[PDB]
Amino acid sequence: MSYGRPPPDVEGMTSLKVDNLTYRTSPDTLRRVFEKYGRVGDVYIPRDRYTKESRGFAFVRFHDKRDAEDAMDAMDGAVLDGRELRVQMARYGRPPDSHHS
Template sequence: MSHFGKSGPPDIRDTYSLLVLNITFRTTADDLFPLFDKYGKVVDVFIPRDRRTGDSRGFAFVRYKYADEAQKAVEKLDGRVVDGREIMVQFAKYGPNAERIQKGRIVETTSKEGGRSRSRSPRPRSGSF
């Protein structure tokens, strides 16, 4: 019952996400990719952006195919200076969705007016707007 011949995007569960903190707003996925690719097979690099302004939010996710390579990247790149900033590299606890925890709920919900008003909009939580 092996699933090795399966084509298509790699299963999220089979990859290892690193959270890269303290990058500058100028730093792009193209800047980070070669740096991390030295240590193993990078599946993708994702830099969350602010929905309104389109600016980088100052952190990134790098996904590796293999755990030992991700581990090596953490050891070699944590504390490395990139674009004048000392970056922090750690394993992302929650994969690509860690950014939701990162920014906290306060930013997302406008709970100042009414407080309980959120409960009457049972929209599926898709990040489409």
């Protein structure tokens, strides 16, 4: 018996990423729709820069994979507005160059 289970060895990363919008979902709705499971270290929409529309995806990012695990396991394909929300690790989390952590 299964259903999909929690993420695999994403232990090598930490940042979350969220995508799929309807042009009106906005970062604010995503904020309280994702931080609710724990927190939202970052929430923004990489939309256009010279028009009144968007690319069709956001970029919520989580500073902690644990809060991202539950939110993603409870928001991936959760169809927030009627389009089928998408949630997945942003792969990021490593330290910058000339430094380590």
